[model samples]
Target: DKKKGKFIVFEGLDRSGKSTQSKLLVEYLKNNNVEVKHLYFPNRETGIGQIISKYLKMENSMSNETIHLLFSANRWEHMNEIKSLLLKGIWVVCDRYAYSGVAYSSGALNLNKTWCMNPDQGLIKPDVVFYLNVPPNYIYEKVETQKKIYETYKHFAHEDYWINIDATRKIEDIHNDIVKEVTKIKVEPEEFNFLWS
Candidate 1:
């Protein structure tokens, strides 16, 4: 059997540069000869994602629980694809995943953490989680809602393979650190693990 691939995820508040940093990592991996695929959650390509997109635009209104479940469902639908990609040794780099689902729900909406985590329990756990811990005031005017979300993400800083990045520095600096950490794992593949398992 082929060696399993690595799953690297980026998580943070709304403007914390997840897209930019993850994009850089993808190109870096490709240049280094690693087969890689990049993905972002709340993928607006699927039917569920369509609903999520609309909800995000404030075009429709839904209860907190309903939206929270929708976000989790979006991830569930992609579970099989994510699993297969890693099994085939194609590295998966994500801009966001299950952590965002739980963080936003619990952080912004004050949803119960356990309730938010339930739907994502069996999802593929990321091999490494690069959490962009940007200060609320660093990129934009500080707002209370985003502040709440930021605090929630901090709870996972000490988790296994969770790298807490000081996002206020230069982009290349962050990319270098991420590449350094990822290369360490690129040579040493590990068995797949489940979320919260």
Candidate 2:
């Protein structure tokens, strides 16, 4: 019997196939009779998230510091829900997590990485992070933005739980590799690890 569920996170730049692969993993787990749920960040449906959406769409203006903390608030509000799901042995497949918070805030706004990470310090840590490193091989105005984010991701590249995947290959190939590794994770029901202090 499954003792607990694993917290799986996906990290990558925009259109890097994070959502697609996260969904695929959720499907694979369900088909194998494993309880799973697919969740995404900036969750945009909450009150705080709505503010983030407005800020993103240019409907409102806020200091970089203000918006950054708002993003953290959105995630903080959702933590309890995530924790309860894990306690029930229901695996959570997240499209993005605190890593994105640090990556984007620091990368895009030139904020300090330490400052970006502070708010998320006590949040749940992922059992595995599928870092889909799909290199931006094309040139575009926004490429610089993506480049910074990617470079920021490199800062945590040494984390043991990070599974860097070359996402430029066939879809099924990546899915197979992820599935192979995911099945091997050992969950500790009584132990809930927090994000880096």
Candidate 3:
């Protein structure tokens, strides 16, 4: 029987170095004779996600709530695929998950936090969530994008299951930290203590 694959997701402020770390982790897995796959949120390829991309790229846009809902709705298409890979023992690493959704949307001036979290209530839970630390300044640069992310998730640094990374560290070190944290979680605890939870 195939063993279960772990679901690891990374989160942080914009340009806080999540992509590079996630990719490096994938490569590390590849080099280790491990079968693996990675996923990106706002999976712009999906029909619902294209609308998310469309609205994001537009100068004129819908309310933040609409964008948030679309992002949440779009994620549903990937659940079965994520579970399938895990069941196959093909570990899955993801760039973002509900953390990004809950962290970012929870801020906007026009959207209430409760409203922001409701859309993504029952999605697949990530087994390990790594957070990248960025300068305090970058978070507020984009409205509802940066500032809120920090404000929303800073407490995660306190949890055993949630790993906080210093984004300022050398690129190589950052990846190593990622590999180390994900490796430590061979057995996941029951707490789904994510930002939304």
Candidate 4:
């Protein structure tokens, strides 16, 4: 039997357009009659997520370790459902997954990679991660223009997974490039290992 649908994840710093492109990717897949679901990390609707959101916004203070676990906890909350969706033949297009949890928090605290990977034990890993690479100068410009509050964390997050995509062009072209990458994985699944103990 053919394997179930794939899990594609868009990872990058804030304003790297991962979210925008993820939304577009989902629409493109649906237009082509592919079943897809878009999921965003720190899904702020859940209790754990709400705490993470507050921490990210600086509304609530948390230790670096505390916030890191909260981010992982948020992912743990949705781990099973994401796996279930993939098993049911639904492609999962996530805005950010465990990578952000590991990259952002660890990058911020200068924590060891092993320590960062520990909390996410047994979480579902993405089959393919489309890491958006954007220049820090450009990211800064966008944050200033939009007056977004998460600029600091986003800057660190971007540096954590900077794969360098030329963001100087039109959004459509950039989105198309992402679609191309994701489509390639439909046939060639990416090799990945979960970051758990």
lDDT tens per residue, model 3, 6-46: 77888887788889988999899989987899888878766
- Those runs of model 4 whose alpha carbons end farther than 4 Å from true positions after fitting are 1-3, 138-164, 186-193
For residues 81-158, write the lDDT of model 1, one tens digit per residue.
Answer: 888898888889988888888778898889999999998898888888999888786311348778877788776777
Please report, as a residue range, the 10-residue window in candidate 1 with the lowest summed lDDT: 135-144
What candidate 2 gets wrong by more than 4 Å, as runs, is 1-3, 139-141, 187-190
lDDT of 4 by residue, 6-82 (tens): 87778766767888888888999999998988888878867888787777677886788888888888888887787
Ordered from best to worst lDDT, the candidate numbers read 2, 1, 3, 4
Return whichever of 2 and 3 wins on TM-score: 2
lDDT accuracy of residue 164 in candidate 1? 85
Clash pairs, candidate 2, are none
Q: TM-score for each prediction?
A: 0.93, 0.93, 0.85, 0.79
RMSD of 4: 5.2
Write down the RMSD of all candidates, one decimal each.
Answer: 2.2, 2.4, 3.3, 5.2
Q: 81, model 3: CA deviation in Å?
A: 0.6
lDDT winner between 2 and 3, please give it. Answer: 2
Measured on C-alpha atoms, candidate 2 has an lDDT of: 0.86
Candidate 4 residue pairs that clash: 133-164
Question: What does candidate 2's lDDT look like per residue over 21-120, in tens digits?
Answer: 9999999889989888788988776789988888877789788889889888887898888888888999899998889889888988889999999988
Instruction: Give Cα-based local distance difference scores for all models.
Output: 0.84, 0.86, 0.74, 0.68
